Design a protein around this ligand. Structure first.
Ligand SMILES: NC(=O)c1ccc[n+]([C@@H]2O[C@H](COP(=O)([O-])OP(=O)(O)OC[C@H]3O[C@@H](n4cnc5c(N)ncnc54)[C@H](OP(=O)(O)O)[C@@H]3O)[C@@H](O)[C@H]2O)c1
Ligand SMILES: Oc1cccc(-c2ccc(Nc3cccc4onc(O)c34)cc2)c1
Length: 310
């Protein structure tokens, strides 16, 4: 089950999220990425930021070498971190991710965030960079064959239009990877992306990992929502599967992180059932503009995506 991107390539609609906090041994990323592939995951989402591209690439390479899959079956994503937005730093950063993962190309390279940072990953000191020049450098990475497709992450409508209306544009972003779940369903952004043939990719679709460093512990726990729990009972599934199936039926490609073997195998059950129209309407009604990731300290950045929240 894949969706056709605006550049002709195909993206599996269910992806495996590989981020785990530093307290989790790096060995786990190798272990679970293999478990994900064995369970049926073909879309693997990583990033320079996650400090796991070595282990994630090892897992993909091992499952190719053991005959389980071919490289063409795997959709691997990495992301350009914000300290490498200056156009001369874009390609070296991609080559470095390819070297670490021992891959010849990524299937998808994304701008991780529009909020450019001073050329340490977290120096916070900002950098003024016209993202159109960053995008031009990304386009050259696709022309060189290092990235099959290119896209963006954490862009708002205004920032997408800055790219879509760039003079001399060669490649539209194939996708915009943003926070998306029933408490923050991005309906307006989703309609906009659909109208421009851009795929919205959902992260934190299961409510986020609720890390005390980024997430307010008092924020509501998505997977304990009464509506998702009732719907989980009706369909004999789980709240997680309801939240994942919700995204698929509204045209969103959805990521799901799990470092637990049983839940990794569970999340591929999203293709085994359907939600009713009334089920989807009830989930729609949970929307409350709730971002689990508190970026309020970065609200001063000229490219802060959540501007005009009030
Ligand atoms: N571009 C960006 O800025 C950005 C930001 C955030 C995330 N992402 C990407 O999106 C991925 C997913 O988002 P996320 O990391 O916030 O996590 P998530 O997908 O919202 O999942 C949150 C938690 O759900 C739990 N879970 C998974 N399946 C479950 C199930 N069937 N039943 C119950 N609990 C379940 C997992 O815990 P267990 O591991 O214990 O199962 C996991 O820690 C990330 O790993 C990353 O690849 C990108
Ligand atoms: O230019 C800037 C400026 C300010 C903040 C940021 C910034 C952008 C994305 C992230 N991401 C994540 C955070 C926590 C858990 C995660 O799991 N997966 C992820 O991607 C992720 C963190 C910081 C970029």
């Amino acid at each position: 089950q894949c969706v056709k991107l605006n550049d002709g390539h195909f993206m599996p609609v269910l992806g495996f999220g590989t981020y785990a906090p530093p307290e989790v041994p790096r060995s786990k990323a190798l272990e679970v990425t293999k478990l994900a592939i064995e369970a049926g995951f073909r879309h693997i989402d990583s990033a320079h930021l996650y400090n796991n591209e070595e282990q994630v690439g090892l897992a993909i390479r091992s499952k190719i070498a053991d005959g389980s899959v071919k490289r063409e079956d795997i959709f691997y994503t990495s992301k350009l971190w914000s300290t490498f937005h200056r156009p001369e730093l874009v390609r070296p950063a991609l080559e470095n991710s390819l070297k670490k993962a021992q891959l010849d190309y990524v299937d998808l390279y994304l701008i991780h965030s529009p909020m450019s940072l001073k050329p340490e990953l977290s120096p916070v000191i900002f950098d003024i960079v016209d993202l159109c020049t960053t995008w031009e450098a990304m386009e050259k990475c696709k022309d060189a064959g290092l990235a099959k497709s290119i896209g963006v992450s954490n862009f708002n409508r205004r920032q997408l239009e800055m790219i879509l209306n760039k003079p001399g544009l060669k490649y539209k972003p194939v996708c915009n990877q943003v926070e998306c779940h029933p408490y923050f369903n991005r309906s307006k952004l989703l309609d906009f992306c659909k109208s421009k043939d851009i795929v919205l990719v959902a992260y934190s679709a299961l409510g986020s990992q609720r890390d005390k460093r980024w997430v307010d512990p008092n924020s509501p726990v998505l997977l304990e929502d009464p509506v998702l729990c009732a719907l989980a009972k009706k369909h004999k599934r789980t709240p997680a599967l309801i939240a994942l199936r919700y995204q698929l039926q509204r045209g969103v490609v959805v990521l799901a992180k799990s470092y637990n073997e049983q839940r990794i195998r569970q999340n591929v059950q999203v293709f085994e059932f359907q939600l009713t129209a009334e089920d989807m309407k009830a989930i729609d009604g949970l929307d409350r503009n709730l971002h689990y990731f508190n970026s309020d300290s970065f609200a001063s950045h000229p490219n802060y995506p959540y501007s005009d929240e009030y």
